[model samples]
Target: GPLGSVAKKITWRKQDLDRLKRVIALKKPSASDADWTEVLRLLAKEGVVEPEVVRQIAITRLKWVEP
Candidate 1:
């Protein structure tokens, strides 16, 4: 089917992961809340990370009190 053929073309490379890592690190610290949300969404969309996993981590982080 057409959709299957298109899916077959989707691929990931180490370079892609590396670039995303850099972008994620650079943007995360100073990014506004909305921007961080968007960044994680984009990362999930690109298959870099699971949105569910991100949500879990976010929940855990939210529970932590700064030292």
Candidate 2:
């Protein structure tokens, strides 16, 4: 099966989810584009979010699968 096929089954624990949300909420960028980039950056440093996917979800505000 293609890696993307099971994307939905890959899940992140609540603690990780909450951390991501907290980082996203703190940045508080007025523009959509700005908000995501900052949030992802913070998560990356905290080691909760992956580096590569940060750029991908920087503007989407959606869940991503972590390898």
Candidate 3:
């Protein structure tokens, strides 16, 4: 996972913009149940500092874009 190496750029993880879209959007994840846990878990494993809040931020970003 080359993304692992890029995680170090958390301060400037510009790459993560597409990562969150591609990975999280892949399965159309709904952060409201067990799958939410699974999603966040994978995000954590992917090496993000705080997967939970980051996910929340991403979701907000999505909504912010849609409307």
Candidate 4:
């Protein structure tokens, strides 16, 4: 199946939030566009972060292009 093919089966859980936070922290220092997109998707699917906040994170990550 393609990526993100499975529908979300569960809402936010404490573990999901913890994992999301850890992923965010790990990616904060340096992460590629694909990595950021994946993290955003994960967060969106898990409902651990607000949509607007995830959008902001995506936007911020997009702007960090290599010179």
Candidate 5:
């Protein structure tokens, strides 16, 4: 099989990082730990970004609210 030409290459930026954080925060407590883990795994697999770095960002900037 012949290889096809690359369609596009995305360059991740701070915005992308913020968006990922926003989406993860939206999932919050309702989202299972497994779900969060899988999402990070998929992102790593896609070459979107580094999982450990993302995890660190998520942890450092995590938001909290009073119930």
Candidate 6:
């Protein structure tokens, strides 16, 4: 039973595109604890494929328990 629904694939990922070179160059994940959200916000804002992907990556990365 396929329900009528259209869900866009919004998984945030670093694509092997020219965009990533500049994007990844700014690897600014710090140990500030409450600041990297701004960086991911900054990161995703620029090179992320789409808005959905951007925010999705934001939440996921923000939920990151970087060891």
Q: Which residue pairs in candidate 4 have backbone atoms (N, alpha carbon, C) closer than 3 angstroms, thus clashing?
A: none
Q: lDDT (0-100) at residue 67 of candidate 6?
A: 34
**lDDT accuracy of residue 21 in candidate 6:** 33
Candidate 2: where are CA atoms >4 Å away? 1-5, 8-10, 30-34, 46-67
> Which portions of model 1 miss their true places by more than 4 Å?
1-9, 29-67
Tens digits of per-residue lDDT for model 6, 1-67:
5436433433333452234334434754444534444444544554434433433343454443333
lDDT by residue (tens digit), candidate 2, 1-67: 5443332333444565677767655665444445456666665555534434453443344354222
Clashes of 5: 0
Worst 10 residues of 5 by lDDT: 1-10
Question: Candidate 1 on 1-67: residue-level lDDT in tens?
Answer: 4443221233435455555556455655332445556557655666544433444334343331212
TM-score of each: 0.32, 0.42, 0.46, 0.35, 0.35, 0.27
Cα lDDT of model 5 by residue, 11-66, tens digit: 44555556666666555533344556655654555565444344444554454221
Most accurate candidate by TM-score: 3
Q: Tens digit of lDDT per residue, candidate 3, span 1-67? A: 4544432345434465665666666656655445546555665655665545565666555451312
Off by over 4 Å in 3: 1-12, 60-67
Predicted candidate 4 versus true structure: per-residue lDDT over 1-67, tens digit per residue = 3455332343434565566666665666334555556666666654535443444443444343322
Model 1 lDDT at residue 55: 40
> What lDDT does each candidate get?
0.45, 0.50, 0.53, 0.50, 0.49, 0.42
RMSD of each: 9.2, 7.5, 6.9, 10.4, 10.0, 7.3
Q: Which ten-residue region of model 3 has the weakest summed lDDT?
A: 4-13
lDDT of 1 at 36: 51
Top candidate (lDDT): 3
Error of 4 at 53 (Å): 7.6
Model 1 alpha-carbon miss at residue 18, Å: 0.6
User: 7 in model 5: Cα distance from truth in Å?
Assistant: 28
The CA lDDT at 29 in model 4 is: 32
Q: How big is the positional error of residue 50 in model 1, measured in Å on the Cα after superposition? A: 13
